[PDB]
Symmetry: D2
């Protein structure tokens, strides 16, 4: 469901840039075994931006097939044209995903009123639950609490991935929504803080390579054991930062390959292969988390 | 032609959101008559964000058909996947456009090296002149002068639309590139300053409703008559700011409707109709410019 | 001591700009009666910047005299020259204050190494406890966690007033310091959040006019009753924001006068009297907090 | 004289932090010989922050004594209390300085109206020309063009040192003030751009070690020979940036020592000695400029 440690899973690729089915299966089994609560398929970390709509759908369908009911699957579904968002979401009706992660229109910088209409329209054309995704550093566009409050009144809009790293948002949004609207961090480095303020979990990049620690950290948090949780957190903190030493998902894909979870660390342009210096930095962070 | 007042033309729509050929013809005749140097078809102001590839190609071909050789046309062609930019660009080879305006990958936040390989590859697969477009407020990524210097060495990368509003960039870029590389403002409120520092022109929103004044201002700036160009700029300055009182192209499409240049001011969601307050502000700016 | 609700008390003045002893007594009694834990005398809210050093000392001595052992007194003691900071601190040795609130040098923007030497030197020339005060929006200068960690190793440096409003700081600093280094918020609007993350109290502007609510909110927080605490918080939140609708301490002085706690709302230039529109805004916030 | 290359002169100190009269005389003779238009005594670069009022007056009187009528001297006189600025200013009336450089109140963050009443009052109580100084990175407050327009109507407020590095301000200010109001850059890296937009000169840090080049660059800019001025600016550009590799005036005092212009590079805490790495960077910048 929508709590605990949710992975924004990489889209592993062969040397040609196409999805690697064996690698994907290996990651999906690693999650099922690790206690991960759900998989976000073709989020930002899954290279949503460089997959075409059919390739995106293939990866989601494949991911659901390979999950085989053992672990719920959320699909990335954002578009910055409201009509395109509706169409793309319609594709996944009756597919088996439990929900959609739908990104704020990126680029065209709508007003808060436009954001409200965009998401309200998306929600009205599906029965799938919708998790709003706010990530202003990528989109140029900031979904404010007041607007999240308005959107939470729509039946199937059920939570938000808050990736600003701005922790005052947690309670500004909580005071405006019902007790079962979910609040998930999209910022690994502040996610334990976010849960300590009342957040319900995290859509994590770090969980790609430390799924068990991340799932244990979020059980502890949800139980009120923040000081036990922080010990795992300090173990992971260099990763939470150094998985962004170069643009995501360049580091986390390299790390997945170095840990043997995927066959190649290939990405699509304009993402570039990891630099030597980035490799050493990520290597050190992995050693610190006790994974090499 | 890649100097002077270049308009980033609105894509005029009927009440259903479909391109209105009659309104487009009127705009194009207006720019031919008013001395505009060229037309950017389906840029940001032309709602690039919300047109699919079919409509995008149609608008560009219709603009070329209506222009009928009387004014150069440049297409917006950016994409955040390098493969898709290359592919959209191929579709316009031998179309009759003189050039492409290609935006930095938005959303995925590539490194400078990524940006370099992106634009180099797009350029490698066409004969068309390419104009790089930097607009960090929309893309979350900033093409730096050093990278622009490296890209200018590629034969058909011929200029930049610099939309940061950061005037330091003009001479940082100019000292790294050859004398025939074109520097074009993409920020109307600072465009005269940009030209006085050595910029060659402006790709303008304001030009949609003040074509003649913009063309004369740019010609005066080109000859060095800055005090004279600034008289004109001071009467346009309220438009230069208030055409962004709500998200572009909401205000400018309203203005074009109020002047009678287009039949409706309809846009595509997530752009919303102009508010009553925006209407009052834009109307006062038009009156300050002497257009109403 | 250094926990709970600490007031950054206004320096009430007569129509001529000099300290008003009757008004000060009335505020000090109101605090003693309200449960306020301590008084910061001649902090930022007390107009430290527009009092000369003798006037500053007079206000501190007067405040301690009037407190008459009923409530501990911390003096503002910052200087941006390290020698001047030491001298100014020496004045208060053996005076009766329990500690100093010492601001980061403002203006000259030292390195982190310079900040470390400045504060280490101050601490070495007094036996008074020192609370570091980080407030980058006023000083242009940001004391980072790593540097706070180094400074906390000095015997008499015992806590920090963190006024950035950046809540990730609470745990970044906690993991680098011992369990009895104190962490106090300097940002009223985020202070309950700050305490919920592990902070020990707040040096508050809002407590000037809502001392009892603020003291009750921080007892509840310290006891783990965050949801009871939040109800008081939502009552006060318009105040926490609107006490800065004009520069502090302009609004809070007007509010103190409107509630009858001080005789005049006079301030020293370049602080100006409250605007009409600001008066109505602050009035509304007071009505909301149930104080008019 | 308030045009051309104006140096913000270092205050050279012996090993004990006391003003070194011999080093000061050498600097002053150097600026007379190198064509510098004037000297700003005890500005930011002159460690205004860390001198008390006694030392501040001494340095200014010693500079006037050594200059001996050969070059105009301007004093730094800002304060964040209006009463104290008025008072420091009175101390220099009939001293022989031609003007004051008065900084916006730092730290207390006054409103635009506050700033207006501040500078108007300072100006009302002197016959000396006043030059407003805007440096938001140090003061936390930004004097806006509209306020500058209002202040220019006061008879003896004659110009502004604009240190934001925001080049849009030049023509926003210039259109609101009369033709004899002086606009002076306070940001060396953007100063040539500032002049090309219509600025009249620069109050410069770089001028401390490259006097002659700075004076020639400013004269060429004044006559409109921008391409020629830019050759000089490109050789100074590493200094313009690297003299801030560590907090000003750490690097420039080191540079003056390495050139032999001052006996020691001692500063007052919280400024610290230059690091080994800063030394290497500044030395390479001096060699790029042709000074070593
Ligand atoms: K709902
Ligand atoms: K080229
Ligand atoms: K200590
Ligand atoms: K004047």
């Amino acid at each position: 469901m929508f709590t605990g440690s949710i992975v924004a899973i990489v889209t592993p690729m062969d040397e040609k840039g196409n999805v690697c089915r064996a690698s994907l299966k290996k990651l999906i089994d690693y999650h099922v075994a690790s206690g991960t609560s759900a998989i976000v398929s073709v989020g930002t970390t899954g290279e949503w931006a460089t997959l075409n709509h059919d390739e995106h759908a293939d990866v989601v369908m494949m991911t659901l097939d390979l999950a085989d009911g053992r672990i719920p699957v959320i699909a990335g579904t954002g578009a910055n044209a409201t009509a395109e968002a509706i169409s793309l979401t319609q594709r996944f009706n009756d597919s088996g995903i439990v929900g959609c992660l739908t990104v704020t229109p990126y680029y065209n910088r709508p007003s808060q009123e436009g954001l409200y209409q965009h998401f309200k329209a998306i929600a009205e054309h599906t029965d799938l639950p919708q998790i709003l995704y706010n990530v202003p550093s990528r989109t140029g566009c900031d979904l404010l609490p007041e607007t999240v409050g308005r959107l939470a009144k729509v039946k199937n809009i059920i939570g938000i991935k808050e990736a600003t790293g701005n922790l005052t948002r947690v309670n500004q949004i909580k005071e405006l929504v019902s007790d079962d609207f979910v609040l998930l961090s999209g910022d690994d480095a502040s996610a334990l803080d976010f849960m300590q303020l009342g957040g319900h979990g995290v859509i994590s990049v770090t969980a790609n390579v430390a799924a068990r620690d991340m799932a244990q950290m979020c059980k502890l948090a949800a139980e009120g054991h923040f000081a036990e949780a922080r010990v795992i957190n300090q173990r992971l903190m260099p990763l939470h930062n150094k998985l962004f030493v170069e643009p995501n998902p360049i580091p986390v894909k390299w790390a997945c390959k170095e840990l043997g979870l995927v066959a190649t660390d290939t990405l699509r342009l304009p993402m570039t292969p990891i630099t030597d210096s980035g490799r050493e930095t990520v290597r050190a962070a992995l050693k610190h988390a006790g994974l090499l």
